[PDB]
Structures are given as C-alpha cells and as structure tokens.
Ligand binder design. Structure first.
Ligand SMILES: CCCCCCCCCCCCCCCCCC(=O)OC[C@H](COP(=O)([O-])OCC[N+](C)(C)C)OC(=O)CCCCCCCCCCCCCCCCC
Ligand SMILES: CCCCCCCCCCCCCCCCCC(=O)OC[C@H](COP(=O)([O-])OCC[N+](C)(C)C)OC(=O)CCCCCCCCCCCCCCCCC
Ligand SMILES: CCCCCCCCCCCCCCCCCC(=O)OC[C@H](COP(=O)([O-])OCC[N+](C)(C)C)OC(=O)CCCCCCCCCCCCCCCCC
Ligand SMILES: Nc1ncnc2c1ncn2[C@@H]1O[C@H](COP(=O)(O)OP(=O)(O)OP(=O)(O)O)[C@@H](O)[C@H]1O
Ligand SMILES: [Mg+2]
Lengths: 75, 160, 119, 256, 58, 75, 75, 75, 75
C-alpha cells in the first residue's frame, strides 16, 4: 500500500530523465545546425525547417513520457 | 522462366529470380534437366520434392492450371550412381508422388524467343523440341584439357 | 484482434478457474502460512511493529514474504504521534506503556478504515 | 452494358466516371435541344435536391447491383458469411468482441458485392495504343478523326466450357465465385476522314503477372479482332488470336 | 461579377484575376510571400495519399 | 507479493530510459541530416527519406519497450 | 505521509538531472557556434541568433521539469 | 523465494537497457549514412544495404536480451 | 541461501550491460564503415571483411559475459 504509492511517485520522477537527454539532444541538434549553416548558408531555409522539425519529434517523446508518468501515478 | 542451379555474376543484390522458379509456375510444361555424369550437385540440388508439395497446393485453390506437365529429364540412367539405396528411394518416392521421368535424355538447346527446348535421347540419338514454361537444369560440367595433356585424368576426366 | 482479445478475456473471466483455481487456493493458504511464520520470528516492540527486519537473514526473508508486515510497519511510520514518541525515546525519554498505549497503531488503523481486532 | 445509368441522355459510358463539382444536381437533365421557358418548371418543388440524389445517385446504383446480382450468389456470400454473422450475434450481449466478429463478415460481403457489381473497366489507354501501332488500322483510323458509335462490355455469366478452360472446374474456387470474371464486348468505330467503320470485338480474362498471389491484369485481351469496313473495301485484322494466347497464359481464378 | 464570385463561393479575393495586383500590395512584407493560385476555390482539395514498402509513404 | 508488485510498477518507470535515448538519437540523426544536407543539398530527397526511416526504427524500440512495460506490469 | 513526502522530495531532487544535461548541451551548442563562426564569419549575427534560440529550447525542458517537480511535490 | 522472484521481474526490466542503446546506436548509424550518402551518393544501394544489415545485427542483441529475460524469468 | 540466490539472479541480469554497449558499438563500427566506404568504395571488399571481423570480436565479449553469468549462477 504505502510502499507501492511511494514507488508510483518515484517512477514519476524517472520521467525527468528524457527531459535531460532532450536538452542535450537539443543543444547537439542546434550545434550541428550552426556548423551545417556555416557550411552552406544559401540553403538556410531547408536546414532550418528540418532543424525545428526534428526538435518537435524530440519533445514529443518527452511529452509522451509525462503521459506514462501520470498514468502509473494514477493508474 | 529458364532457371539453373547457380546465380550468374551479373546479378546484384536486388535480383531474386532464383526464388521464383517454384512460385511463378502458374501453368505450362515444366522440365527438370539433369546433365551427364560427372556433374556437381547430385543430391544437394534436387528440388523436385519440395516443388511437388508447393505445386500440390496451387492445384488445390487454382493458382496452378490443371493442364500442366512436370517431368524429370535425366541424361543419366540413375540419379545417384554410387549409392543404390538412395537412388532406389528417390525413384520409389517419385512414383508414389506421381512424377514422370525420362532417362537417357539431356537438354541440348534453349530458344529464349519462342520458349523451345531441344532435347536429345543419347540412347537413341533422336532429338525433339518441346514447349516449356518453367525450366530448371543443373549446370553441366566439362573436363579441362590441361589435366589430360599431363596424363592425369582417367576416362570421364576425373583425377586417377 | 479486438474481437478475439475481447472474447478470450471474457472466457478467462467466465471460465478460467478450471486451470488456475488451484494456484489461487495454494497462494491463499501460503500467504497465511508465511504470515503465521513471520509472527514467530520477528522483533515486535512494545507496539506491534516489525522495527528490526534486518536483525538476521531469516528475518529479512520472513518480513518480505509476509503480507501484513508491510502494513504494520508502514502504519507505524505514517502515524505522526508514534514517531514523535520514538524521536523522544532516542533522546532519552521513555517509560512504561499501558494496554491502551500499546494499541495506539490499531486505533490509527481503525480511523483510516482498516479492520483491526484486539483493542 | 452500362449498369449506372440515369435519365441523362448524353455520355452514357462516362456517367459513373465523371465526378461533377456540383453542390446539388441541375434542375433539369441535359437538354437535347433548345426549349422554352414554360417547358421547364421554375422554382422546383420542395425537397427536390433530396429527390434528385435518390433518382440520380441511389437508384442507378441499386440498378447496378440488381443487374449484376448473378455474380454474388456464391456459397461464400450466401451461407458462410451470414452464418458466421449469426453465430456471434447470439453472444453480442456478452462482450464487444462478438459484435465485431458478427459485423465483419457483413462489411466483407458488401466489399465483394461492391467490387463485383461495378462495370468492368479495362485499361482503354492500353487498347488504343495497341491498335494505333497496327498499320492496317492506322491506314483508315486516327485518334484526331475517330469517333465511337457504340460500346458494350459485360461479364460472361456462369462457368465456361470445361474443355477450353478446365481451370474453373475447381470446387474450392466455385465455393467463392459463381461467375468466371471474364468479359466480352465490341467497339463500333468510325473515321470522319476516310469514312471507314470497324467493329472491334475482344475477349478478356484476368491473368497473373510477375508475382505469386496478386493479379497482373484483370482484363487481358486474349482475343482482339477487327472487321474493318471502308468505302468498298472489307478487311479483317487479328491483333490478338486466342488459339496462340491461351497456350502461354491462363486465367487467374480470383478468390475473395 | 461580384455576385458570381459569391454564388459560386469563390470568396478568396483575387482568385479569378489573372494579375491580383491587390494581392501583391498586401504581401509586400509578408512571411512566405505568395498570392493565391489562379481560379483557386476554397472547397477544392487535391490531396493524395499512397502506401509504400516504407512508412509515411516514402 | 506486495513487493513484487512494487517492482513491477518500478520496472515500468525504467521503460522511460529508451525514451531518453530515443530523444538523443533523434537530435543526433537530425544534426547529421543538417550537415549531410549542407554538404550536398542536391540529394535532399534520399537524405530526408533515410532520416525518417531511421527515426522509425529508433521509435520502434521505444514503443516495443512500452509494450514490455505493461506486459511485466500485468504479467 | 512523511514517507510519501520523503520520496516526493527525493523525486524533487531528480529535477536537477536535466539541469545537469542542460549545461553540457549548452557548452556543446556554443562550441559548434564558435567553430561554425570561424568557417563563415560573414554571417555572425545569423549563427548568434540561432545559438541563443537553442539555449531557450533547452530551458523549455528545464522549467518543464521544475514545474513537474513542484507539482508532484505537492500533488 | 519471493525475494528472488522480485529480482526475476527486476532483471526483466533491465532488458530495456539495450533497447535504449539500440535506439541511440540506430540514429548514429543512420546519421553517418546520411553524411556518407551526400559524400558519394553513387553507391546508395550499397551503403543502404550495409545500413540495414548492421541494424539487423543490433536487433539480434535486442531479441537475445529479451530471450535471456524470459529465460531467467521462468528458469 | 535465498539472498545469495537473488544476487546470483541479479548478476545474471547484469550481463545485459555489454549487450547494450555491444548494440551501440555495432552502429559505431558500421557507421565508420559506411562513411569510410563512400570515401574509398573501390576497396569495399577489404573494409567490409574488416567490419564483420570486428563485429565478431564484439560478440566474443558478449558470449564471454553470458558464459560468466551462467557460471556464477550455478557456481
Ligand atoms: C432490417 C431493418 C433495416 C435497417 C435499416 C437499413 C437502412 C438501409 C437503407 C438506408 C441506407 C442506404 C445506404 C446509404 C449509403 C449509400 C449512399 C448511396 O446511396 O450511394 C449510392 C451509390 C452511388 O455511387 P457513388 O455515391 O459512389 O457516386 C457514383 C459516381 N458519381 C458520383 C459520379 C455519380 O451507389 C451504391 O452505393 C450502391 C447502391 C447502394 C445500396 C444501398 C442499400 C439500398 C437498400 C435498398 C433496400 C431495398 C429493399 C428494402 C426497401 C424497399 C423499398 C420499398
Ligand atoms: C442493430 C444495428 C445493426 C446495424 C448493422 C451495422 C451497420 C453499421 C452501424 C450503423 C451505422 C449506420 C450509419 C453509417 C452509414 C454508413 C457510413 C459509411 O461510411 O458508409 C459508406 C460506405 C462506403 O463504402 P465504399 O467501400 O463503397 O467506399 C468508401 C471507400 N473508403 C472507405 C475508402 C472511403 O458504404 C456502406 O454503407 C458500407 C457499409 C454498409 C453496411 C451494410 C451491412 C450489411 C452488408 C451487406 C449484406 C450482404 C449480405 C450478403 C448476402 C448474399 C449476397 C446476395
Ligand atoms: C484577428 C482576429 C482573427 C484572427 C484569426 C487568425 C488570423 C491568422 C492570420 C494568418 C496566419 C497565417 C500563418 C501562416 C504562416 C505561414 C508562414 C510561411 O509561409 O512560412 C514561410 C517560412 C519563412 O519564409 P518567408 O519568406 O515566408 O518569411 C521569411 C521570414 N523572415 C523575413 C523572417 C526571414 O518558411 C517556411 O516555409 C516554413 C513553414 C513553416 C510553417 C509553420 C506554420 C504552420 C501553421 C499553419 C497551419 C495552421 C492550420 C490551422 C488549421 C486549423 C483547422 C482547425
Ligand atoms: N499513375 C497514377 N498515379 C496516381 N493516381 C493514379 C494513377 N493511375 C490511376 N490513378 C487513379 O486510379 C483511378 C483508376 O485508374 P484507371 O486506369 O482504372 O482509370 P480509367 O479511366 O479506366 O483508364 P482507361 O481509360 O485507360 O481505362 C484513376 O481514376 C486515378 O485517380
Ligand atoms: Mg478503364
């Protein structure tokens, strides 16, 4: 009873792990964009759209995690 | 629909014709040709037992037309020369399954335009031409002369 | 798939006891046999709380294999007053307990809605 | 024969193909001549748009199913799927899984009825490319001067002669199909330049191509004959002969 | 002509004008500078979709 | 018993680890796509296609684990 | 009670994990901005803008966790 | 007894660790293929094949782990 | 007894750590092969043979671990 509830809240903390990797994966993504941009700035628009697009899919998993987080915490 | 036992060197990784011999046999006359001994792939290349079972399912639901002919054209008189017990089981199982065989006949020519296969009965020397739609043949071998010029091979062309 | 999964899940509800009712009767008495064995080998303080489950290797296994061991210890730690007393015991303030004080946790369990006997 | 046909007089062989952008249906059917204001009815009656959609979309669609009802009366559609729907309908109140398994065989029957009742549409662009390659036809006919006088193309009913096509004598295939899936028809053509006319008779059957389970061409012309007629010259062209085409390829025998 | 655009629901300004000069003046500083395509109706949808051996139709 | 139940819900939290690596693997893949795009923007099609195809396999493992999670949580 | 609070505050500590990864991703982001700037300094302002833009998406994850942290710490 | 059982289900959760690494390793491999494609796109089929091949070897370890999981879970 | 057995089972799960690292190492090696292949595709046969060889050396440690695991699991 009290033990399982303590584990449920504990797992809810684990969801903050992707939130960490998402930050690193984000900086890495824009780190490459600056290099890719300095390499060929004529095609900035294409790089830019693909840049933000990837970011969307990145935080998508992050949001997905929070779902599972509250699920086990309440289901 | 002409198939063989090995893949040529001009095919890339995207070619899979070898896998269509059994699948793409919707109809027509089929021939499984065996060259004259000595040849490579005596028992490790006999796929006429798996094809019969796969082609038995096609006839059940109509994928394979009922008016088809599959016969084993064996140039040699026996399948396994150095094992009678093995050859007896094969010839015995071919009959139980319902397959027809023609001995002393070897493939001679292949016309890719009209799908004509010229056969010849070495025993009688009488050749014929027969329409085919799915043909499989074990690649025939050939003795190399440099081994005969040195006086090493005996008869058929194998080392003594 | 939804049709088959919803069907087999129904059959497992209606039927199913034909092959698993034995594993439930076994675990039912087993869950009671191991609990009765825990009360035999476990350190209970002046209140019915297993405060020393790691006293020995045999106690660690008995505490984990029990069902009520988690509750008797969780309810004792979840009672604010009971821990305020222990915090005073550690400082040097302790005395004898009456039969009513010994059941401070049973009263706490009853308040939450538990079914506890021996008041 | 064209199954989907309304009271509209023009473009019969295109009625089911043409997808109009109209919000509702026109007040009157396409006029064959100039009429008077009193010949038509101003401010059509109330609930007219719903009436038109019934007599111009629903009714010709049901006449198609009724015209080609002989292609769905197989043991699979008539006995198997309904019986499978009733077995699970008795348990529909026990759980949701039975409602699904009781409705699936009905949606499956509609799909086979839907696909089987459609008019047989062959790849007409492959056909015109075939005839415009023949010099004896292009001698009198050209696309910029050719016009269609009549068109007929319909499935052949029942099983065919069990000597020319022994494939259809299969009890497993008959359990799913009551027809052959073959079609026969003709094409009445005319050339406004040379004044020539010809009747392009053809027979089709589904064939397998290059693959194991999928059909290659559901309408393969194994017989294509043209009886050309000009001012005073009569020619008979044979683009595809059946005696030579049936020796190389056989029908497909659709299942489901 | 204005009634024709309304009764046909061609209420996208400048769709039937070969040179929608009014559309260029409003987009002189717009992001993704573009004018409506000629004879574009607000109801037509030419969207397609295909299934390939790969996912997402690729 | 009650503890094994606590471990089950706990394992469900561990399933959020691929979610973290999947985010990083995404930013890394899109980071390379940017560079690979600047190096040769003529072949946007192939590069872009192979990108999402990789993203597919990446997230495939993600949802695979989620299934494994609920599986252990109820079996 | 306090025990459940003890694991709540324990989870609250986990929020400092993205705070850690966010620092590394930041260093990586500006690292690429520097090398990318050297190869094509003609577009300094462009790189600079996208640099700070990425650092924002980093804190987006960071603040998100802190929100999730304080929430579960009191809910 | 139940203690060992708790570790059994715990080890089962640990099998999701290669799943996380398999996801990251996938993006890295495809990220390189993207760059390798822009470099010399003449060998698409060659490079493309080697990519999927390597990936297949990854899932081999993945499925190997899962098999190992159920094995220790029941033996 | 029951405790050391649980640790035996626990160590058995630890063997999946090289499995994860081996999966990631696979993508890295194949990534180097693809990129190195595009730079010099004329000698694909050489690079390709060396690739699989390295992959074999990887599975050596993999099998070594599983061997070690089953050993301590019963010895
Ligand atoms: C047992 C109790 C009964 C339960 C109630 C069941 C209600 C059944 C009737 C209402 C539903 C009808 C289906 C509507 C959805 C299809 C819409 C449509 O019409 O599209 C036509 C479509 C038209 O094709 P289209 O819409 O794709 O467009 C064609 C191409 N263009 C657009 C270019 C023109 O045709 C069909 O779908 C085939 C015919 C559909 C058959 C529908 C069932 C009719 C049932 C008739 C019953 C007769 C016996 C009983 C009644 C006797 C009367 C006295
Ligand atoms: C107690 C209630 C019983 C209800 C029965 C189940 C009916 C479904 C639930 C009620 C919903 C009713 C309102 C929805 C209206 C339909 C909406 C729709 O999208 O349909 C469009 C569809 C259009 O389908 P379509 O395939 O032609 O085109 C659409 C293509 N896509 C999907 C790509 C867009 O038309 C239909 O109506 C199909 C469903 C009809 C269901 C008829 C069930 C019986 C099957 C025929 C019996 C044949 C028996 C065989 C006998 C032997 C042969 C002689
Ligand atoms: C005021 C009361 C009523 C308000 C109602 C709302 C009015 C909204 C006003 C119109 C907003 C239109 C926004 C369009 C943005 C497009 C910009 C663009 O073309 O990108 C060019 C950009 C930039 O190119 P650019 O050349 O156009 O601009 C360059 C910008 N500078 C100068 C800074 C360099 O490049 C792209 O193509 C990227 C495309 C990304 C598109 C992302 C936006 C998607 C959102 C639109 C979909 C929403 C659908 C909602 C449907 C809901 C249905 C339920
Ligand atoms: N290459 C294609 N690419 C995209 N969509 C296609 C393509 N071919 C067909 N489609 C769609 O599939 C529909 C059916 O094609 P189909 O060939 O049967 O039409 P058709 O009018 O009968 O041609 P034909 O006059 O040669 O018989 C088409 O209306 C089209 O919307
Ligand atoms: Mg057509």
């Amino acid at each position: 009873m009290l033990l399982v509830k303590a584990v449920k809240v504990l797992v809810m903390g684990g969801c903050m792990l992707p939130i960490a990797f998402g930050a690193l994966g984000t900086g890495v993504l824009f780190a490459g964009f600056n290099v890719a941009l300095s390499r060929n700035p004529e095609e900035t628009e294409s790089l830019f759209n693909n840049t933000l697009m990837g970011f969307a899919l990145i935080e998508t998993f992050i949001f997905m995690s929070i779902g599972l987080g509250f699920f086990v915490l309440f289901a | 629909p002409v198939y063989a036992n090995r893949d040529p060197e001009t095919w890339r990784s995207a070619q899979h014709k070898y896998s269509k011999y059994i699948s793409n046999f919707k109809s027509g006359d089929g021939y499984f040709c065996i060259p004259e001994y000595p040849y490579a792939g005596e028992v490790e290349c006999f796929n006429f037992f798996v094809s019969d079972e796969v082609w038995k399912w096609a006839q059940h639901h109509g994928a394979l037309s009922p008016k088809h002919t599959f016969t084993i054209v064996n140039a040699n008189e026996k399948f396994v020369h150095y094992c009678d017990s093995a050859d007896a089981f094969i010839k015995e199982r071919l009959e139980k399954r319902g397959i027809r065989v023609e001995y002393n006949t070897k493939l001679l020519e292949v016309h890719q335009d009209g799908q004509k296969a010229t056969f010849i009965n070495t025993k009688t020397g009488e050749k014929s031409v027969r329409d085919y739609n799915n043909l499989y043949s074990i690649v025939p071998s050939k003795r190399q002369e440099f081994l005969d010029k040195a006086g090493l091979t005996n008869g058929n062309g194998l080392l003594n | 798939g939804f049709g088959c999964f919803s069907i087999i899940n129904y059959l497992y509800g209606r039927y199913g006891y034909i092959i698993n009712e034995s594993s439930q009767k076994r675990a039912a008495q087993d869950l009671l046999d191991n609990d009765m064995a825990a009360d035999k080998i476990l350190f209970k303080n002046r209140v019915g709380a297993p405060t020393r489950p790691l006293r020995s290797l045999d106690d660690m296994m008995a505490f984990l294999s029990g069902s009520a061991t988690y509750d008797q210890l969780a309810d004792y730690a979840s009672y604010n007053h009971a821990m305020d007393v222990n915090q005073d015991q550690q400082a040097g303030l302790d005395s004898w307990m009456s039969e009513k004080d010994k059941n401070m946790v049973k009263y706490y369990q009853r308040s939450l809605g538990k079914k506890v006997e021996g008041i | 024969q064209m199954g989907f046909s309304s009271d509209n007089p023009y473009n019969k062989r295109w009625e089911y193909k043409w997808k109009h952008s109209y919000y509702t249906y026109p007040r009157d059917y396409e006029h064959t001549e100039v009429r008077k204001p009193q010949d038509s009815k101003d401010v059509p009656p109330i609930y007219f748009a719903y009436y038109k959609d019934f007599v111009d979309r629903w009714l010709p669609g049901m006449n198609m199913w009724w015209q080609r009802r002989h292609r769905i009366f197989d043991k699979f559609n008539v006995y198997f799927l309904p019986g499978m729907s009733l077995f699970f309908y008795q348990f529909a109140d026990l759980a949701l899984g039975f409602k699904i398994m009781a409705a699936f065989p009905l949606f499956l029957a509609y799909t086979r009825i839907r696909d089987k009742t459609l008019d047989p549409d062959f790849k007409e662009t492959y056909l015109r490319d075939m005839i415009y390659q023949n010099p004896e036809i292009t001698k009198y006919f050209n696309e910029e001067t050719i016009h269609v006088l009549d068109y007929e193309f319909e499935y052949l009913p029942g099983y065919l002669c069990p000597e020319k096509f022994p494939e259809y004598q299969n009890k497993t295939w008959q359990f799913f199909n009551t027809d052959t899936a073959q079609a026969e028809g003709f094409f009445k053509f005319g050339d406004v330049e040379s004044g020539a006319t010809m009747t392009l008779k053809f027979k089709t059957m589904p064939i397998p191509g290059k693959f194991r389970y999928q059909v290659g061409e559901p309408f393969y012309f194994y017989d294509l004959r043209a009886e050309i007629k000009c001012d005073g010259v009569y020619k008979e062209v044979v683009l595809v002969d059946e005696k030579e085409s049936l020796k190389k390829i056989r029908p497909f025998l659709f299942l489901i | 002509e204005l009634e024709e655009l309304t009764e046909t629901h061609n209420y996208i300004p400048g769709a039937k004008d070969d040179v929608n000069l009014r559309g260029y003046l409003a987009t002189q500083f717009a992001w993704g500078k573009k004018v409506i395509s000629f004879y574009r109706h607000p109801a037509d949808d030419f969207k397609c979709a295909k299934a390939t051996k790969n996912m997402l139709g690729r």
